Each structure stands twice: as structure tokens, then as C-alpha cells.
Design a protein around this nucleic acid. Structure first.
Ligand SMILES: [Mg+2]
Ligand SMILES: [Mg+2]
Ligand SMILES: [Mg+2]
Ligand SMILES: [Mg+2]
Ligand SMILES: [Mg+2]
Ligand SMILES: [Mg+2]
Ligand SMILES: [Mg+2]
Ligand SMILES: [Mg+2]
Ligand SMILES: [Mg+2]
Ligand SMILES: [Mg+2]
Ligand SMILES: [Mg+2]
Ligand SMILES: [Mg+2]
Ligand SMILES: [Mg+2]
Lengths: 91, 97, 197, 97, 127, 25, 214
RNA sequence: GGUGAAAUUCUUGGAUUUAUUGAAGACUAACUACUGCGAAAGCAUUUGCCAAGGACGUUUUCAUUAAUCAAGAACGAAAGUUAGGGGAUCGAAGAUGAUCAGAUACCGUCGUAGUCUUAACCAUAAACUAUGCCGACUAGGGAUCGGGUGGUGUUUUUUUAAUGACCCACUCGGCACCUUACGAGAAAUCAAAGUCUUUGGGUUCUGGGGGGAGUAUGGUCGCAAGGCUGAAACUUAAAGGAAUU
């Protein structure tokens, strides 16, 4: 059964710290504890060890990432920016 | 184009999936074409390429990972390499891709 | 410990002696274990590679940037921070960059930087929610927490100390020419109040 | 009641066109509703053409033209006698002069 | 035969500029405005103020070496009227009347593409 | 008074009523 | 009273060899002295002059040519090509309603290391004995025309160095090249480069500048 | 500078004006139309990639799989809200100069939020064609957009002259328009608002004199602003629509 209506994982905090703070933590803890696709072995086995460290349970691969996500939006822009600059130089 | 030719050989031909069966088929000379996923490890890719050079068999590079390759052969488990033992009514061998 | 950014242990070969050298890098976003890092003037423009500032195009995103060639990384080292190359000066070789604070700096083209952004970004977007999590954050850094307000102290303890109401009493903006023991508050402030615009 | 079948503008099939600003007062106007007049003047005048003709090098060179498209809101056009309010039957006429 | 300057008449509303430069535009010769000739503050843009301003420009254009001008007419431009003011025609005519030869009269009103927001608001200047 | 200023006066009045009902609760 | 006009040198301005008569006009500057000399204040001047002035023919009354000075040789200024642009009224006459406007611009580098953006403008034309009153293109002709124009502008540059490109633009050879390559797609009536602007520059190259001044 | 006229403001420390070169963010002029696309809201610089869609063509397939729809759902201008970025311009607030009897308005000069974007909210507009959707029929014309068909047509009039572009005649679909009033309407007007006392093709939603009132209360959604739902007491002989003088 749906045990909580809206707090979700932040139900451990009870009634403390304010609803707005608990929603902000809810967004980033769902991201923090989610399993992600491995870009190497293709499985859904990538979990966060520590902030910025994302390790696949199989294939032993560890990738440097964001604090609470594997990849941040500014990082994907950088990767596309660096790819575009490298392609133009090698053109 | 490629995904329909892969679909037709699965429904009408002979094949095997996985690394240990592809290497065994290459070693026995029974393979006509092997398809390798994009996210296949380069050590495995260079080793499957090297057996196929000895076997003198064509290698197709699947644009898509093992998840897309497994889906493209009608399966719902990840498939890293597919070897075509013999095509059925598919023209995957005759077509240049 | 004490650093939000993850550290990449990158191992090179010593050119002049048969042995392996271990180098402690600040891991860039997308750098993985088993990745081949390339460092040098002729290195290719890829994330994690170390290149001199003169050998990258306009708009390149770099981190661990050297202020001077050979100081082994000074700029854009904290998690999620980066430096943008905004111009080149070929004669008297100097690269104009944009710092994470928005400052326009001119650096020699021989200074090196690592392509990409420092990993672990977005850390400050999560509230610590409680004193205990700030306690463990500063347990590994230094003894700067918790912080007693100066107005909560007696006059012998702080320039804002004392009074029958907790108040500062004189302007909290303190001149740059003040001396130690006076520089409590907003030192050499150009403006005060909430920033608008 | 309704005054015009084309309600006040030229917009049947759009729902929204774009706003343009009036030249005289800078009121936001839907581009189709705006009264539009083309402004074609000589670069100088009608009386100073001869004055420039014998006081310039390059005899009878071009006498260039000044080009401008003027966008008026309804009130500015009426106040400047550009559209000149008409009768109920004569306002159905769409001819320029 | 003729020494050529650039006339550069800025004819906006509320004023009129007659700014003769050198052929490259960097060096200024006799910038005389309409507010330098009449002191009434509502006829600075008037044709009379512009004609006096233009003939004072031609008074200094002679005795420096300038005998002919390339005329560049300027309205305000940008997000503004794009229409030359009442004094541009008087200033241009007075330059011809003063003996300075003319050549390649051109309109150089700065014309944007669609651009930043013109001032006035949604309902405009309503008086 | 056009309907929208009557509407604006009523909206401001309504959140005076639910503000004084906030104290009473 | 100061009268700063009794203390300037009154230089002279030339034109590159890729033109007709090269006497453009004088230039009032300063007497060059010590203590912040006024000799290098003549190195960066930019002069806009009409092509009909530089050719003697009124067929180029538009296409004003932009000249930048490079070196000061005695009491004489040597210039070089800095850009081309049409007169404002020339654009306004060509732009008319009930016809399509097509524009194409590509950045491209010459054989000399000159980076420059080459514009182009084209307008659809009504055929002879045509009845319909507008003659718009169909937005695939426009893309096909714009791709052809971008190819011709790119192809004529990357050879034909800045001096040769200038000699390529004075007789409007590009306009005939575009017209012949586009008349198989849609008829056009006012095909013009309309603008040349300089983006980057190579080293000074005094030998190439002296080749343009005899 | 600005204005109707001024004042505020800047200005010999050089304002305004001129030239060269940068930076930033917006926006995409003219072409631009009784033209196009989208379910609507909306959508106009180039190129590349991605998925989608209408119409047309079809001697292709399936064979009733359909129409409209309580509950339920996606999107939904602007303003507004949260958290970052960015913040040139204009600019609710505010400040200031004028006008004026006053002017906390219009006019003038600054100027925060906002205006842009990312990730979420909101769910409202004269969100309009104030005109629900599907289907059939009833009158004439020309123009225009997209597709198609046919000219022993023009352009490439160069020995019997590609493909596009154009011209002519049809056709399907679409945005519209003009004429007339068969017919309708209270009229304005309307090819639908026609095929209605000669009243029935199918189906959804809504209204029952004007106010009180989209108010109070309750419920539900929303962070909030607010949204959806939604009275009664009381009060009144008109309120209102179109046209005539
Ligand atoms: Mg404290
Ligand atoms: Mg105490
Ligand atoms: Mg005490
Ligand atoms: Mg003390
Ligand atoms: Mg009325
Ligand atoms: Mg609308
Ligand atoms: Mg269109
Ligand atoms: Mg445009
Ligand atoms: Mg419903
Ligand atoms: Mg509504
Ligand atoms: Mg309605
Ligand atoms: Mg349509
Ligand atoms: Mg009622």
C-alpha cells in the first residue's frame, strides 16, 4: 500500500525542518539513491558510493559524476561543447 | 533496414546469441556473419574481430548497445554479439550492410 | 575527506626511470576508472586531458587551471566549477579566461588545465537540514563551526559585544585600512543591503 | 453589434499574429490590424532639386529616394487623417484610393 | 580638384546636428547644432536654426580647406522614429547655397532588424 | 465601476475574510 | 583662442591597384611630434567611399567600398580592402512586396589568411506572360537556391586571394554565376552580393601591400 | 536631453555628436499578404539531427474496427509562484520633474520585481468566429495555398527545343472573399445563423427576468495567489438586445 501521500523517502524526518526544505531534499535523495544505466556494461546497476562517485555493482567500473546524479545538465552541455570544438579542430 | 533484416533471420533462419556461442561458432567455421553491439568491451570486440579475421567472416557493427541488440533480435535479455549460422529468407548476407 | 570533489588516482610511467608514478588529480565529470588520460601540449581535446591554455579553442571548458605554468593547478578546483577560455593573444602569448567568480583574468598560454568540469557539482543545492550534518561537514575540515554572533558576546570579546539590546551600535562596514581586532563585520564593503539587479 | 465582418483586422485562420508598435505613439498593435502606409519621398524636396543640381558635382547623379514603412494604430491614423472615418456602406470598400 | 569632407546631418526631433568630418570620419570640422544658433528651446529643430547652423559649418569648412561634402542624412533610428526631422532639409539646402559642392547624398538612419523593446509601454504615449 | 475592478475589490476583500478567519481558528 | 586646425599635416589617401583612379581625398590629422606622436594615429583609419568614385562609372553608384589604411608612405596613405556594402536606398528599392526575399551568408577564408563573411541577396521574379500577381517561391526552392548560393560563394573564395576577389566583385561576376546556376530552379531578378565584411586578418605582409600600390 | 511648452538630468573633469573595436542579453525588421502550419494556446534568421502531421495520388491492405462523449486524462497566451542561471532593453512598485484647484494620473527622467532561460507549479483571458463536433443536401462567380491530371502552350523560339518556373482547362482538400437572398432572422446580418408550427440525421455541454453573486458556506486542487464546484436571506419592474428619428 502507498504508505505516505507525499513525503516519500523524507518520511524519516518526521515533522521537522519545514516542508519546503524536506521537498528540496526529497528531489535530491531520490536522485541520490536511484539506480542508473551503466554506459559500459549496459545494466541498471550504477549506484552512488560517495558524492561524485558512481560505481556499477557488476563490471567494477567507477565514474566521476555529480553529487546526486550521475550526470549534471551543465556537464552534458560541456561534453557536447567539447565534442563540437574537437570536431571543428579535427575537421 | 538493418533491424528488419535482423528480424527476418531470427524468424526464418539459424543463429546463436552470446559471446561463448559466437566464439564457438567462429571456431567451428559455421558462422557467416557476426553482429557486435556498440557498448561491447573493446577487448572483447578486438578478440571477436580477430577470430573473425581467422574465420574470414564478415563483421557488422551494430549502432546500439547490447540492450538495443537484444531488442532487435526479438529478445528481452541483453545480447552482446549475434552470429548468423545461416540465413533463412533474409538478405542480410547478400546486402552490403 | 574535507573535499566535495572526488579524486582520481592517475598513474603514469616515469620517463627517466623504470617505475610507476601516481598522481592525485581532481576527477572531472565523466572520467571513469580505466580511462586513458593524456597530458601535454600535443594532447587531444577530450574530457580529462591536460592541455596548455593556448592549445584549446574558444569556449573550451577547463578545470584545475594553472595561474602560472608549473604551479600544478590553482583555478577551478571545487566541485562543479570550471574556467572558460574567452580569448587568445598570440603575440606575447597570453590567454584570457573567465573565472568561476566572473573575473576576467589573463594567463600565459603555457599554463595547463584539465578539459571539463570538476565532478560532484550540485552539492550545495541540497540543504544540510540540521546542525549535525554541518557538524560532520566541518569535522573533516577545520574548527570554524559553530559560530557565536559577536552581538551575543560581552564588549571585551568582540567589537559588537555588549549593550542592553543585542545591536552593533556603529556601522558594520569597516575600512580596509583598519587593524586586526577592528575588522569584524563587512570589511571594505562597496555597498550593503539585498542585491537587486 | 458587430461593426465589421473582418472584426477589426485581417486575421482568419491564425489566433495570434505578432505585435508591432505604432510609429507615432508606440502602442502595441497586431501586425494585421495596423494601418500600414509606404513612405516614398525624394531625398531632398520638390523645390531644392534644382538648387542641389547646380551646386553639386556628378551632374544629374541620382536624386535618391527615402523609403520607410509606417505602422499606425487606429487612433493615431484617425487623428492624422490617414483613414478618415467612412459611412456604413462606403466602409466595405477596400480600394486604396 | 575638390577637397571632400563628410557632412553627416543628424536631423532628429528636438535638435539638428551638422557635423562635418574628414573623409575617414575620425577628425571633426565645425560641429554646429541648432541649439547654438537660436535660444528659444522649441525651435532648436526648426529649419531656421538648422540653416544658420549649416552656414556656420560652411563658414569654417572654408578657411580650413574643405570645398565639397558627402552628405549623410541621419534620423534618430534604433527603436525611434526613423523619419528625418524638420531641420535636415534646411541644413542640406544651406550647405549647397553656401558654395560647398555636394556629392553622393545618402540616408544613414540606423535601421534595426526587430530589436529591443521600444519605449512607451503596451498602450503607448497617450496624451 | 467595471466588472474587473469590482472583481479586484472582491478578491482583496475575500483574503481579508480568510485572514481574519485565520486568527479565529 | 587655440585654433587646432593650424597644426595638422593634411595627408593624402590612395587606393589599391584593383581599382580605377586612386586619388580618394586628403586627410587632416596633426603635426607629428614627440611625446605621444601622431604618426601611428594614421595606421588604423577606415574610409568609406563609393565604387562609382573609385571607377568613374555610375553603374556602381551603389556598392560603397570600405578602405582601411595600412602603411604611411611619406605624405601619402596606402589603403587596402576592408569591406563592401550597398547604399541603404539600393536595398530599399529592391525589397518590394509580392515577391520572395532570399538571403545567404557563409563565413569562408581566402587563400590568403583572410577570414570574411560573404553575404548574398536574391529576389524571385515574375515570368513573362505571367498572370498571377505575386510569384512566391515554395520554401524548397528557397532552400535549394540558398544551398547553391552558399556553394558558389564558398567555391569562389578559398582560391582567388583578397585582391583577386576584389577584381571578382567589381564586374559582378558572382551575380552572373548565381543567376545561371539558379535559373534552373526559380527565376530571380536582383541577385547581389550586397555585403563583404572582414572578420580576421593575417600578418601585415608589406610585400603584398606594395604589390597593390604602383 | 526631453516636451504641447518647460523642468528633472548630463556637460570645458569635454556632455551631445564622429570613427575604430569589443561585451552582454534580448529580438528576428523590411520580404509579411483577407498567405501557410498546428487540437488549441501558438508558431517567421541559417544549417544539421530526431520523431510527427495534413492534403493529394493509389485497380494496396483490413473489414465496421465508427460519431459524440459523464467520470477520467494531456496541453493550455500573459501575469503570477519556487529554486538556480542570466539580467541589454522596456518596465506593475517606488523615486523625481511638470501640469492642475488638487494629480499619490495621463506627459518627462530614473528605476526593483518582471521581461529571457533551466527544473518544477498555476490553469486563467474579449482563451472570440462572443458561432460545439460528426454527417447529408440547397446558388452563382473570380481569386489564392497544397497535391494531382491533360495541353502536339510559353521560358531554355538555339533543325521537330530536358527538369523546374509560368499560362490555359479540369479535379480534391484548405484559408478566405464577392454578388444575390432563394431561405432564415427582432434586426444588425447570415451559404450558414438555410433545409423550423409543412416543427425529429446523430451526439455532448450550457441558459430560464434584473440584482444580491460567482458572494457566503462546505468540499477538492494549489506553496501562495487563487482554480473548480456553488447557495440562501433579502431586494426590485424592469434590466437587456437590434434598429428609427
Ligand atoms: Mg551563531
Ligand atoms: Mg551575555
Ligand atoms: Mg552581562
Ligand atoms: Mg571595543
Ligand atoms: Mg458601437
Ligand atoms: Mg487570440
Ligand atoms: Mg508560407
Ligand atoms: Mg527575418
Ligand atoms: Mg469533462
Ligand atoms: Mg474562459
Ligand atoms: Mg465563451
Ligand atoms: Mg489553408
Ligand atoms: Mg436569473
Amino acid at each position: 500500500a502507498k504508505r505516505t501521500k507525499k513525503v516519500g523517502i523524507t518520511g524519516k524526518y518526521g515533522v521537522r525542518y519545514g516542508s519546503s526544505l524536506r521537498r528540496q531534499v526529497k528531489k535530491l535523495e531520490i536522485q541520490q539513491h536511484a539506480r542508473y544505466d551503466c554506459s559500459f556494461c549496459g545494466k541498471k546497476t550504477v549506484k552512488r558510493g560517495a558524492a561524485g562517485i558512481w560505481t556499477c555493482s557488476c563490471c567494477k567500473k567507477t565514474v566521476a559524476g555529480g553529487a546526486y546524479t550521475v550526470s549534471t545538465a551543465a556537464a552534458a552541455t560541456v561534453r557536447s561543447t567539447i565534442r563540437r570544438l574537437r570536431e571543428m579542430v579535427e575537421a | 533496414s538493418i533491424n528488419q533484416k535482423l528480424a527476418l533471420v531470427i524468424k526464418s533462419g539459424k543463429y546463436t546469441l552470446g559471446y561463448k556461442s559466437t566464439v564457438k561458432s567462429l571456431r567451428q567455421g559455421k558462422s557467416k556473419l557476426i553482429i557486435i553491439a556498440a557498448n561491447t568491451p573493446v577487448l572483447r570486440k578486438s578478440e571477436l574481430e580477430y577470430y573473425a579475421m581467422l574465420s574470414k567472416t564478415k563483421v557488422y557493427y551494430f549502432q546500439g548497445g547490447n540492450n538495443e541488440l537484444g531488442t532487435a533480435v526479438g529478445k528481452l535479455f541483453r545480447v552482446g554479439v549475434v552470429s548468423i549460422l545461416e540465413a533463412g529468407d533474409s538478405d542480410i548476407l547478400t546486402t552490403l550492410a | 575527506s574535507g573535499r566535495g570533489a572526488p579524486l582520481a588516482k592517475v598513474v603514469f610511467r616515469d620517463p627517466y626511470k623504470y617505475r610507476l608514478r601516481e598522481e592525485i588529480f581532481i576527477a572531472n565529470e565523466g572520467v571513469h576508472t580505466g580511462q586513458f588520460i593524456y597530458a601535454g601540449k600535443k594532447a587531444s581535446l577530450n574530457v580529462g586531458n591536460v592541455l596548455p591554455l593556448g592549445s584549446v579553442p574558444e569556449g573550451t571548458i577547463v578545470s584545475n587551471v594553472e595561474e602560472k605554468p608549473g604551479d600544478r593547478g590553482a583555478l577551478a578546483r571545487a566541485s562543479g566549477n570550471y574556467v572558460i577560455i574567452i580569448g587568445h593573444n598570440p603575440d606575447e602569448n597570453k590567454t584570457r579566461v573567465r573565472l568561476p567568480s566572473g573575473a576576467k583574468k589573463v594567463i600565459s598560454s603555457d599554463a595547463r588545465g584539465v578539459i571539463g568540469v570538476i565532478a560532484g557539482g550540485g552539492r550545495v543545492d541540497k540543504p544540510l537540514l540540521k546542525a549535525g550534518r554541518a557538524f560532520h561537514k566541518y569535522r573533516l575540515k577545520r574548527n570554524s563551526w559553530p559560530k557565536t554572533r559577536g552581538v551575543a558576546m560581552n564588549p571585551v570579546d568582540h567589537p559588537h559585544g555588549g549593550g542592553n539590546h543585542q545591536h552593533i551600535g556603529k556601522a558594520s562596514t569597516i575600512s580596509r585600512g583598519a587593524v586586526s581586532g577592528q575588522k569584524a563585520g563587512l570589511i571594505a564593503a562597496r555597498r550593503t543591503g539585498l542585491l537587486r539587479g | 453589434p458587430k461593426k465589421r465582418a473582418s472584426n477589426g483586422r485581417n486575421k482568419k485562420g491564425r489566433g495570434h499574429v505578432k505585435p508591432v508598435r505604432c510609429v507615432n505613439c508606440s502602442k502595441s498593435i497586431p501586425k494585421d490590424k495596423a494601418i500600414k502606409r509606404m513612405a516614398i519621398r525624394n531625398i531632398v524636396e520638390a523645390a531644392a532639386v534644382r538648387d542641389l543640381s547646380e551646386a553639386s558635382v556628378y551632374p544629374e547623379y541620382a536624386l535618391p529616394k527615402t523609403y520607410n514603412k509606417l505602422h499606425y494604430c487606429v487612433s493615431c491614423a484617425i487623428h492624422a487623417r490617414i483613414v478618415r472615418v467612412r459611412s456604413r456602406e462606403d466602409r466595405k470598400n477596400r480600394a486604396p484610393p | 580638384s575638390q577637397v571632400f569632407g563628410v557632412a553627416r546631418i543628424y536631423a532628429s526631433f528636438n535638435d539638428t546636428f551638422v557635423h562635418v568630418t574628414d573623409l575617414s570620419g575620425k577628425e571633426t570640422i565645425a560641429r554646429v547644432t541648432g541649439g547654438m544658433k537660436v535660444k528659444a528651446d522649441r525651435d532648436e529643430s526648426s529649419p531656421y536654426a538648422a540653416m544658420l547652423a549649416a552656414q556656420d559649418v560652411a563658414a569654417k569648412c572654408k578657411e580650413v580647406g574643405i570645398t565639397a561634402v558627402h552628405v549623410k542624412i541621419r534620423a534618430t533610428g534604433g527603436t525611434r522614429t526613423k523619419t528625418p526631422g524638420p531641420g535636415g532639409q534646411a541644413a542640406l539646402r544651406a550647405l549647397a547655397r553656401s558654395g560647398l559642392r555636394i556629392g553622393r547624398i545618402e540616408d544613414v538612419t540606423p535601421v534595426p532588424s526587430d530589436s529591443t523593446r521600444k519605449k512607451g509601454g503596451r498602450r503607448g504615449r497617450r496624451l | 465601476m467595471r466588472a474587473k475592478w469590482r472583481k479586484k475589490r472582491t478578491r482583496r476583500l475575500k483574503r481579508k475574510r480568510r485572514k481574519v478567519r485565520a486568527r479565529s481558528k | 583662442v587655440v585654433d587646432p586646425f593650424t597644426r595638422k599635416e593634411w595627408f593624402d589617401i590612395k587606393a589599391p591597384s584593383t581599382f580605377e583612379n586612386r586619388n580618394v581625398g586628403k586627410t587632416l590629422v596633426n603635426k607629428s611630434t614627440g611625446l605621444k606622436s601622431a604618426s601611428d594615429a594614421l595606421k588604423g583609419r577606415v574610409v568609406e567611399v563609393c565604387l562609382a568614385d573609385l571607377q568613374g562609372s555610375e553603374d556602381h553608384s551603389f556598392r560603397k567600398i570600405k578602405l582601411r589604411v595600412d602603411e604611411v608612405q611619406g605624405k601619402n596613405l596606402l589603403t587596402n580592402f576592408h569591406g563592401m556594402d550597398f547604399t541603404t536606398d539600393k536595398l530599399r528599392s529592391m525589397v518590394r512586396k509580392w515577391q520572395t526575399l532570399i538571403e545567404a551568408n557563409v563565413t569562408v577564408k581566402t587563400s590568403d589568411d583572410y577570414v570574411l563573411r560573404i553575404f548574398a541577396i536574391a529576389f524571385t521574379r515574375k515570368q513573362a506572360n505571367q498572370v498571377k500577381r505575386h510569384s512566391y517561391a515554395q520554401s524548397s526552392h528557397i532552400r535549394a537556391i540558398r544551398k547553391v548560393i552558399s556553394e558558389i560563394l564558398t567555391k569562389e573564395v578559398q582560391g582567388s586571394t583578397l585582391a583577386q576577389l576584389t577584381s571578382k566583385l567589381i564586374p559582378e561576376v558572382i551575380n552572373k554565376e548565381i543567376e545561371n546556376a539558379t535559373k534552373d530552379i526559380f527565376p530571380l531578378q536582383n541577385i547581389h552580393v550586397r555585403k563583404v565584411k572582414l572578420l580576421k586578418q593575417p600578418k601585415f605582409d608589406v610585400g603584398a601591400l606594395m604589390a597593390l600600390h604602383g
